Amino acid sequence: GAMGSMERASLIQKAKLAEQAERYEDMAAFMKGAVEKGEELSCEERNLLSVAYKNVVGGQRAAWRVLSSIEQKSNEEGEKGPEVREYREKVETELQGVCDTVLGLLDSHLIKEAGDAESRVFYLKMKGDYYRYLAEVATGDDKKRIIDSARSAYQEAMDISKKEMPPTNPIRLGLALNFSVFHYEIANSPEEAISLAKTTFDEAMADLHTLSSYKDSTLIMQLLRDNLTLWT
Amino acid sequence: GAMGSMERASLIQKAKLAEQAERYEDMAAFMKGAVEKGEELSCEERNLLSVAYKNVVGGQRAAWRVLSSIEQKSNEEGEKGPEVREYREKVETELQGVCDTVLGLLDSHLIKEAGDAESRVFYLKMKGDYYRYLAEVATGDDKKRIIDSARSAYQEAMDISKKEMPPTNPIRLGLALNFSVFHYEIANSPEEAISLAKTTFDEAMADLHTLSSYKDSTLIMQLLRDNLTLWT
């Protein structure tokens, strides 16, 4: 690899520099490099991983949306030229590229039957999310196999978290938020989306007295609310 | 090239899409492709060129600054590790890469003894600016040769513009602003910086009654003011 001859600790340091310079591509390559060393990431390191990929794939999903949308206008009685589909396709391909990279890392290095339950859940949720990102652009039988892959990752995460985390823990909250958005927006399951977000909001309300140590929990709870709004 | 088999008109279109998706790298590759077709750019096309490169080199100069600055803190009684110099060097190399690309295009395709005076000035100013960007990171005799290159491009631009453009024209204004900043910040010539910005502000004030058709002219005039502030 291009990062194979660099010390793990130096890779983490350069990830942190790249974040500060706002170089998410770089930040992401440095973190991939660190992961490939074959050692468990800490909590701080896993966040550095997801923040980096999150931003990279983030810019791509947003450019895709801009382009898909321009490609629907131009699909409504003008006028012509394939350029916009062509470019939309170029961008789609990059995005599939990055998701396969992330899914590769998760499957090759991070997802294990061992470790903390908080980390097991963290990675399985990330698997869920990267499949979901693939599902947003995929078609046909391909789309079908991805949806199932997202579902299995998210479900297994849910089993682990419902058993081993308080209902207020923001990983478990983020996970259930993401899963419910998957049911609604990807899997065509508004019934399942709604009862998940409901169960999840309710069970956390019942405990709001305990989490006083973050109100990172509360932003997600508003998102759950902001969501049950449009879905009902 | 990667753009060699694409139609010129399609390249322009995809530049415009890349701008809207905020993909300046892409936008820049598409415009380089269009330039390589060997045809004069219009006014609209030249702007598409500089907006694209401007943004690419812009993000790099800003990451460089973040890193150079962190590299001075860490150069003041802690602590150690070469990582920050290493990364700063990686980023510097990318930036030199893009400037050489732009200077190549200008020299190979755009700078001509023929055409509009507005275009001749536009490209020579751009040459000035890309050398100046190189000067900001260069050292030693290399730095010396670059400074002279910037100077000659900016000077020749000035000769053309002082003769063939009204004192209020925002290209001539942007050019003199940039040249004066070069004298101050790159060439260690505060005397020359000040008298240029002065002459340039004054001569435009004397004509402010004519430009009523943009007040793009006026923002630059404030910049000239905002500058004569710190320099005196």
Report on the architecture of this protein.
Chain A is mainly α and 232 residues long. Chain A has a single domain (1-232), classed as 14-3-3 domain (Delta-Endotoxin, domain 1, Up-down Bundle). Chain A is 76% helix and 0% strand. Chain A binds chain B through residues 10, 13-14, 17-18, 20-23, 26, 59, 62-63, 66-67, 70, 81, 83-84, 86-87, 90-91, and chain B through 10, 13-14, 17-18, 20-23, 26, 59, 62-63, 66-67, 70, 81, 83-84, 86-87, 90-91.
Number of helices of chain A: 9
Assign the CATH topology of chain A: Delta-Endotoxin, domain 1
Oligomer: homodimer
List the helices and strands of chain A in order.
HHHHHHHHH
Q: In total, how many domains does the architecture of chain A comprise? A: 1
Question: How would the blueprint of this fold be written?
Answer:
The structure is a homodimer of 232-residue chains.
Chain A: H1 8-21, H2 24-35, H3 43-73, H4 83-110, H5 117-135, H6 140-164, H7 170-185, H8 190-205, H9 216-231
Helix pairs in contact in A: 1-2, 2-3, 3-4, 3-5, 4-5, 5-6, 5-7, 6-7, 7-8, 7-9, 8-9
